[PDB]
């Protein structure tokens, strides 16, 4: 019983972390506002739809 | 008298236009926010102090 409970708990925790961090989709264009980049810049990903 | 007056008027008008448009100094770094430039970009001039 403990093993099954821990399996379920880990699954739920990983799902929640993924939802909080990334979500469940990816966009083609990303906006970056981190140094040393001046102001904001546009970056492009690879294979967003397939991922 | 008319010639002198028009000379003075032209001088004053040109000074006012210059003040309104540029001012009386130039900076080394300029910020550009015009299409097709994405977001804002930084540009650098030539010989600002001498000018
Ligand atoms: C089962 C794995 C548990 C991992 C816990 C670590 C939490 C990750 C950090 C939470 C976000 C922090 C944002 C500053
Ligand atoms: C069992 C439920 C499966 C449906 C999950 C749908 C998640 C939302 C996906 C939205 C994608 C939007 C693409 C632009
Ligand atoms: C003696 C020369 C007179 C020139 C008059 C032209 C004025 C220039 C335009 C004024 C600024 C317009 C901002 C939209
Ligand atoms: C007869 C008056 C002459 C003085 C004109 C000064 C104009 C202001 C210039 C400011 C330059 C600042 C450099 C950073």
Curated annotation (Swiss-Prot), chains A, B:
Name the tissues where it is expressed: Expressed at intercalated disks in the heart (at protein level). Expressed in the fetal cochlea.
Which cysteines in this chain are paired by disulphide bridges? 32-43
PTM comment: the record says:
Sumoylated with SUMO1, SUMO2 and SUMO3, which may regulate the level of functional Cx43 gap junctions at the plasma membrane. May be desumoylated by SENP1 or SENP2. Acetylated in the developing cortex; leading to delocalization from the cell membrane.
Where are its TM segments located? 1-21
State what this protein does.
Gap junction protein that acts as a regulator of bladder capacity. A gap junction consists of a cluster of closely packed pairs of transmembrane channels, the connexons, through which materials of low MW diffuse from one cell to a neighboring cell. May play a critical role in the physiology of hearing by participating in the recycling of potassium to the cochlear endolymph. Negative regulator of bladder functional capacity: acts by enhancing intercellular electrical and chemical transmission, thus sensitizing bladder muscles to cholinergic neural stimuli and causing them to contract.
Its subunit composition reads: A connexon is composed of a hexamer of connexins. Interacts (via C-terminus) with TJP1. Interacts (via C-terminus) with SRC (via SH3 domain). Interacts (not ubiquitinated) with UBQLN4 (via UBA domain). Interacts with SGSM3 and CNST. Interacts with RIC1/CIP150. Interacts with CSNK1D. Interacts with NOV. Interacts with TMEM65. Interacts with ANK3/ANKG and PKP2.
Query: Which ranges make up the Extracellular topological domains here?
Result: 22-51
**Disease note:** Oculodentodigital dysplasia: A disease characterized by a typical facial appearance and variable involvement of the eyes, dentition, and fingers. Characteristic facial features include a narrow, pinched nose with hypoplastic alae nasi, prominent columella and thin anteverted nares together with a narrow nasal bridge, and prominent epicanthic folds giving the impression of hypertelorism. The teeth are usually small and carious. Typical eye findings include microphthalmia and microcornea. Oculodentodigital dysplasia, autosomal recessive: A disease characterized by a typical facial appearance and variable involvement of the eyes, dentition, and fingers. Characteristic facial features include a narrow, pinched nose with hypoplastic alae nasi, prominent columella and thin anteverted nares together with a narrow nasal bridge, and prominent epicanthic folds giving the impression of hypertelorism. The teeth are usually small and carious. Typical eye findings include microphthalmia and microcornea.
Location relative to the cell? Cell membrane; Cell junction, Gap junction; Endoplasmic reticulum
Protein family (similarity comment): Belongs to the connexin family. Alpha-type (group II) subfamily.
Q: What is this protein called?
A: Gap junction alpha-1 protein
